[PDB]
Amino acid sequence: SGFRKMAFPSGKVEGCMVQVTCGTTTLNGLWLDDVVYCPRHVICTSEDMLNPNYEDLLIRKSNHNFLVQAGNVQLRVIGHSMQNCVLKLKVDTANPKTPKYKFVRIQPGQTFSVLACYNGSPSGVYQCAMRPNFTIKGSFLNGSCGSVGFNIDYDCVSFCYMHHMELPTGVHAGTDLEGNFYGPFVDRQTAQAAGTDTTITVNVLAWLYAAVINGDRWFLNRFTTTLNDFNLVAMKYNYEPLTQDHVDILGPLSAQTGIAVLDMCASLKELLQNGMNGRTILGSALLEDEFTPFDVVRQCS
Amino acid sequence: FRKMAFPSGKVEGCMVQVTCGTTTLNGLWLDDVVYCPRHVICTSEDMLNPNYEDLLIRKSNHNFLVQAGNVQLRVIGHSMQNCVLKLKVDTANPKTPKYKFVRIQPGQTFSVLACYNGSPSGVYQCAMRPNFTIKGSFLNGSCGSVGFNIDYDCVSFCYMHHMELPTGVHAGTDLEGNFYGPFVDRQTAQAAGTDTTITVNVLAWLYAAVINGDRWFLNRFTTTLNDFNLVAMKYNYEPLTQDHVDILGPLSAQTGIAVLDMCASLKELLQNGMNGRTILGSALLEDEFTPFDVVRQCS
Ligand SMILES: *[C@@H](O)[C@H](C[C@@H]1CCNC1=O)NC(=O)[C@H](CC(C)C)NC(=O)OCC(C)(C)[S@@](=O)c1ccccc1
Known part of the structure; x- marks a missing residue:
């Protein structure tokens, strides 16, 4: 990749x-x-x-x-x-x-x-x-x-x-370093369980921006969506809803590529709803969700 | 992992x-x-x-x-x-x-x-x-x-x-200034030789996947060293040597899976693929963990 x-x-x-x-x-x-x-x-x-x-x-x-x-x-x-x-x-x-x-x-x-x-x-x-x-x-x-x-x-x-x-x-x-747990965990040697996990949508979008930067852009469609419509669809695929902060941290990659955040969301929505149909992105059929927008800029530039 | x-x-x-x-x-x-x-x-x-x-x-x-x-x-x-x-x-x-x-x-x-x-x-x-x-x-x-x-x-x-x-x-x-490979420090487009997969490392990583409770790719079968190496070479995998088998000893003992047993499981993966499943998160067989890497991290 x-x-x-x-x-x-x-x-x-x-x-x-x-x-x-x-x-x-x-x-x-x-x-x-x-x-x-x-x-x-x-x-x-x-x-x-x-x-x-x-x-x-x-x-x-x-x-x-x-x-x-x-x-x-x-x-x-x-x-x-x-x-x-x-x-x-x-x-x-x-x-x-x-x-x-x-x-x-x-x-x-x-x-x-x-x-x-x-x-x-x-x-x-x-x-x-x-x-x-x-x-x-x-x-x-x-x-x-x-x-x-x-x-x-x-x-x-x-x-x-x-x-x-x-x-x-x-x-x-x-x-964190003020001692507040992330999540609903407590420091006791008791049985505890991780919630069901979901896919980090903002990082998948960063990944698609990375693909575009590298000339891999078959998945760009002509349509757009609202943030609310996208969030409601995404949750049906076990993707996280986007926050305003997520939209903002995608700003630099949106500006670098000229692809509005909500247009990329519509492209992702089509990938979710239609699958890859046998294609790859950055060499994979799997979408990556552990690269933030900052991680992408750091390795592309 | x-x-x-x-x-x-x-x-x-x-x-x-x-x-x-x-x-x-x-x-x-x-x-x-x-x-x-x-x-x-x-x-x-x-x-x-x-x-x-x-x-x-x-x-x-x-x-x-x-x-x-x-x-x-x-x-x-x-x-x-x-x-x-x-x-x-x-x-x-x-x-x-x-x-x-x-x-x-x-x-x-x-x-x-x-x-x-x-x-x-x-x-x-x-x-x-x-x-x-x-x-x-x-x-x-x-x-x-x-x-x-x-x-x-x-x-x-x-x-x-x-x-x-x-x-x-x-x-x-290296730090003596000798290239790894047939390359030259001139501003020209250079191709490398055909790459192959590091077989001993794939095996180390399969043992890592077992150690972390992921063992769907295992099978009951075994193979000989030479028969495995014939299949490996066919799939552009590097040869597995007896030194490699020995190096894999500790991971073998830890899991109770003989090296040539794991070779048979890898042979099946090579011929059948992963069928959409993943190992340790990866859709692909990972070959950049050495046996030492796996052991040092599981210890
Ligand atoms: C460090 O000085 C630099 C690291 C490179 C730059 C981009 N990524 C890297 O890893 N080294 C070079 O730029 C190097 C210098 C020569 C050894 C003198 N040249 C190099 O790596 O060239 C890359 C090519 C792919 C050869 S590009 O320059 C080229 C050249 C000719 C024809 C097509 C493409």
Whole structure:
């Protein structure tokens, strides 16, 4: 096809990874300025993980119960607090590798890079898309919690994900960096289930724009649609409805190709209703939904 | 199951920008030497048949502008090793990792740090194709981007980017400046030899699909090594060697599926197709995970 999942370079995030241990439970934390962020379930024994009372568990803890290490080197904890599902550990050293950063809460469909880490040590980097059911298809083993997802804009690292759990079907769930879960999940070792997933329409449209940019445009029809008519049809094919924000983020690709967003929607609608009829797009009979409009521009330009 | 790249930070701290005339690309700064593609020294009227030794002897140290961020590094010497230029600078890179230069075999995988103007832009996993191309994502200005693997603290550099072929695949050198494949650093349209599929890697990925509970493509049958290889060659798959079978041992043990059993399942896929089903999300048989890749990620 000429497209591939591409992560951002991970070095600026690698420089922020530490390990956090409480008892024998070690996970990863994110060290920015003089604060380390990590999943609050580090304070849980395996027994607590069944039905933890986090407020009560935290009361029993003191600064001297947290072992924070950058590599083998201990970072002294001088303060702690809980913000939703993340623990914030104030430390006595500002991280000299702290990048320009911010904390962002993403929407389904947005992609980000994951720096998978174990014992504070990066193992691999790969791109994930936040699914409409607020799960990601990660590659996470025991000890991966506290690994983060991020995007990089110029010099600024936008942190959008911190890893907390795996679901029965093998997909993954987590929080933003303010500790608010994506989706209806809770940090308890209880049976939970991912909602039925849907196709990320805005990313499929980005994919069709990519195909057009590359001269593959058999599927462009002469018709258009309203956003409401398109949304009602799309849901019948298990595609997500479009938001105004989706229409807006397709703006640049619409301008680059001269194909109005609602005209592309009518072309997609015909593909949904009539199928590919044996044809391919960018070399495939399957439509791709894990490239955002930004991902497309990045790899086409 | 995720195609996973190595963390790129150790390589990012080595990337610099190299400019000669109106040509800019990337260099790799290790200790006091910057490595980059030699075609940086070529002008327009040079690129079609460049007599590189002749063009290089006519250059001075000051013709090369090297920048690390906002800082210019003074070139105090230069030499050429095959298709790579080595620029000696007056400063050591303190971010130089432990490293080695390796020449990888077809079928082996590596991470690419794609860079533009000395700035890292993206990281992804690639495999050396049997025809010695790589299916990369590289645009104008990407030359000098490198491919690498990481072992403990040691970066093994295996690839430096030089060119795109008309089919959209890519070609480059090892860090001794020798091309992978029959390609030449001149501005001409070059075709590669017929590519084939990396069979040992397809098998590794089928084991990965089982390990993740996807086992619809399995069958009860078995095959001999030679009969499988006859079918593989027919379908433009690479031969499977006994070393490959042995390399696949751990994945075999993990799943309790003998290698030649999985070969029989792959034979069925080749002859019957996937029938619209998918494996690990893919409509196609994936051949850019090595056995090591699969094991390291499932461990
Ligand atoms: C880095 O300098 C650059 C990377 C290329 C640019 C686009 N994607 C890449 O991967 N390398 C080159 O531009 C390279 C330079 C020569 C080795 C001196 N040339 C190259 O890759 O040319 C691509 C062709 C497909 C050959 S295009 O230029 C062409 C040439 C002749 C006839 C048809 C098409």
